[PDB]
Design a protein around this ligand. Structure first.
Ligand SMILES: CC(C)C[C@H](N)C(=O)O
Ligand SMILES: CC(C)C[C@H](N)C(=O)O
Ligand code: PRO
Ligand code: PRO
Ligand SMILES: [Mn+2]
Ligand SMILES: [Mn+2]
Ligand SMILES: [Mn+2]
Ligand SMILES: [Mn+2]
Lengths: 478, 480
């Protein structure tokens, strides 16, 4: 069958991937007792946009649910799926003649059918007529709440939909649940995105020099990913935090735009991940700017390396993800105690939630078409109201096929440290004279992408991780 | 005063630039009979956004009117200007403590006042209270229609604005008219954006090899602009058209994403421009993929080069822009005839609008903070209802301070050529035995950025343009 491909050494992605997703979705819906026979899934693709009221086009990136089901790259489409038969129909815009001048070839419906390997293709302006001829019982549309953004996903609409029976409650939980579990074809793409991004991280580590601006490495990373990987988009805005900026978790946005000069003695925390055909990667590398870990830097870094490997070593089906978060917490506290930053009973530290002072984010999250993938908190899965754990993007138990990030970290964040020092229940553990040396240190995060298997996990990421590996890589000439 | 700067060799842009814009706006408004004392201009900045319903942040780029007035890079702000005094107040978001953990330092209001050199800084939630205490006559908000996109620019709104007297008709044409004329400080930035983008185009010409994907050069261009120029954004999606794709004017979008393999014999048309601190550049270079112009390629290319230089040579204050478009049309028709593609009376060809078959777009457009800058069609200025000319983004007369693109091109577009061949009023001019050789040629566009001056123009762009210059550049080796 046909495949998406950007030539050279880029990955060929079979369109069968999306056909399988459609089949899996139909299979799940059929088993839902509330789903009537003759139901049709109706999805609306993303539309082209411009900057504000200007004529400046924004580069189109497909809506995630629509991509998952159809893999369509063109704006302005709809896509439907007959639940009972699994038959798929793509609706494409009927373009004006002038499109041939300004935008490119006006492809036939048959072209799109062959390109996407769907059962039928029609024009968007005929959707009401086509659906009417099928005489559906009900249209299943997509509406629900994303548990990371809090945004409501807006359901499909077209002129004449009001004359149909529409249900907007059933579909969202079901398609979300399908996305949580990656097919072998999906895993092939995620292996690829990790491969390219890992390569790019390596090039960045080799390229870093004292005196460079953070954004120079952002630029290099994205250039490697695009030119060598065909990754026109990143999965998220590159986080290139040097020195104290490595303590800022999502540094790099417009308000803090990777504009610090890298200095001798800085730690770097680079969290960057290219996107290929709307599939994510999410990788963080931490390393000394000058290529040589100091004693303090080595201690903090190896603490996180320890929690990283411990979590990965423990992960397998049935494991409760919050237990992994607490494992990482305990390890960090043990190591910070060994360093002399902390003193006392680690058990008591844990009881006082001291771990969250140093890791004020969740251990990791589902990853897929989105960097923070859907399905972390389905109905019946509750968020844990404790420091650190409340920032977990899922509280589920691990099952085979899930793709998760493993991203423990340790940071020295002033307002969190100050809060702890003011609290008698936590201050007693902190050795102020030692901690003072680590003010402005920033932080370390080690972030891997992994897949849950029947017996454990598969690691997708491949970057240098031990102190020796990192120093060797950075000293590389070629 | 303070300056915007991304270090290394990037441009220091004084915040005085935006102070001058605010002053100029006020000075214009004070002369407007519709403006009464005690008026306050109220602008709303862009807000941060995400992809669809996801948690994936979109990199924030400031709204253009707000940038012109304040130069603010942070999302979620408002800005007001007291017309009578010119006093400026920036409103910044009141951030949650957790911002310190995830996004970074929670800067003080004083930090922002010092950063942007405004007269006062307040929190956004206080805007109603602060404006109330000032006892304005009327709030002047921004609403109008962009004549390129057709979009309505939405006016500022805040909780309690309904308690105020609001006018949304006065401001838009006035701020637009200020934007049309670039200050010396603004020109410094556009010189810079052209410098970096020109350097990047040159690096691309040196690097292009047969067998590469078009997007490899897109990537390289943007990497040069960001890493060397501090240009995090491009001014528009890169157009990297090779072979027949060079006939597609805005090739490179999601539907045609620069994904063709460059072949020996192809012409390349690369239209790319980095953006620095929300100021545009807009440059097109055309060249043979293999670094050697064929005879046919040289002829088409030099035809566009002739019209480019003719227009640039003719441009000066008082010139009517549509006349420059017609000048380009005439030169293209002359040269296509000199090539044997066309035969007959060139005067007759012009009367039949034959030029539009080969250049089905406007000669050029205003440029500034937006690549297609505002103000091309103010009240009174009409769009000419003829092929080609109707696509002009302005029909104004040239005056000093205007910044325009000069981007003639010649393309071989099948459905337009076929229309002409089926039209008795046009068909006889076309020599099929020669034209057939140029089917699938693609096209050539030569795009420069210029400033209208008292004496003519200032050319901002600095790339190789003659056949000799281009072949040298591609060989790794010019005078504008
Ligand atoms: C918005 C972009 C497609 C503009 C294009 N670079 C031009 O010459 O007008
Ligand atoms: C910036 C965020 C959207 C994603 C971030 N890279 C993470 O590890 O979660
Ligand atoms: O957003 C998240 O969940 C991870 C943890 C901190 C960095 N990114
Ligand atoms: O859109 C415009 O006006 C110019 C002319 C063709 C290429 N871009
Ligand atoms: Mn990450
Ligand atoms: Mn992550
Ligand atoms: Mn242009
Ligand atoms: Mn252009």
């Amino acid at each position: 069958g046909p495949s998406f491909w950007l030539g050279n050494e880029t990955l060929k992605v079979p369109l069968a991937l999306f056909a399988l997703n459609r089949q899996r979705l139909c299979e799940r819906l059929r088993k839902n007792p509330a789903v009537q026979a003759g139901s049709i899934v109706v999805l609306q693709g993303g539309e082209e946009t411009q900057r504000y009221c200007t004529d400046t086009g924004v580069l189109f990136r497909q809506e995630s649910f629509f991509h998952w089901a159809f893999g369509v790259t063109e704006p302005g489409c709809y896509g439907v799926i007959d639940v009972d038969t699994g038959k798929s129909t793509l609706f494409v815009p009927r373009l004006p003649a002038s499109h041939a001048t300004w935008m490119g070839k006006i492809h036939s419906k048959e072209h799109f059918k062959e390109k996407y390997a769907v059962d039928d293709v029609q024009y968007v302006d005929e959707i009401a007529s086509v659906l009417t001829s099928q005489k559906p019982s009900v249209l299943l549309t997509l509406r629900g709440v994303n548990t990371d953004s809090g945004s409501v996903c807006r359901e499909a609409s077209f002129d004449g939909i009001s004359k149909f029976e529409v249900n907007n409650t059933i579909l969202h939980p079901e398609i979300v649940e399908c996305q949580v579990f990656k097919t072998d074809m999906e895993l092939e793409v995620l292996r690829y995105t990790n491969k390219i991004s890992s390569e790019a991280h390596r090039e960045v580590m080799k390229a870093v020099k004292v005196g460079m601006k953070e954004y120079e490495l952002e630029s290099l990373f994205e250039h490697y990913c695009y030119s060598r990987g065909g990754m026109r988009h990143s999965s998220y805005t590159c986080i290139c935090g040097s020195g104290e900026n490595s303590a800022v978790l999502h540094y790099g946005h417009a308000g803090a735009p990777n504009d610090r000069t890298i200095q001798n003695g800085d730690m770097c925390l680079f969290d960057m991940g290219g996107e290929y055909y709307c599939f994510a990667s999410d990788i963080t590398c931490s390393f000394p700017a000058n290529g040589k870990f100091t004693a303090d830097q080595k201690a903090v870094y190896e603490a996180v390396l320890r929690s990283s490997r411990a979590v990965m070593g423990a992960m397998k089906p049935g494991v409760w993800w919050p237990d992994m978060h607490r494992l990482a917490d305990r390890i960090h506290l043990e190591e910070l105690a060994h360093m002399g930053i902390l003193s006392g009973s680690v058990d008591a530290m844990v009881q006082a939630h001291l771990g969250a002072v140093f890791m004020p984010h969740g251990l990791g999250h589902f990853l897929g078409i989105d960097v923070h993938d859907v399905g972390g908190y389905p109905e019946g899965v509750e968020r844990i109201d404790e420091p650190g754990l409340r920032s977990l993007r899922t509280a589920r138990h691990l099952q085979p096929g899930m793709v998760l990030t493993v991203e423990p970290g340790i940071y020295f964040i002033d307002h969190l440290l100050d809060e702890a020092l003011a609290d008698p229940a936590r201050a007693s553990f902190l050795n102020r004279e030692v901690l003072q040396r680590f003010r402005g240190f920033g932080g370390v995060r080690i972030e891997e992408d992994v897949v849950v298997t029947d017996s454990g996990i598969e690691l997708l990421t491949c970057v240098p991780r031990t102190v020796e590996e990192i120093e060797a890589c950075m000293a590389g000439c070629d």
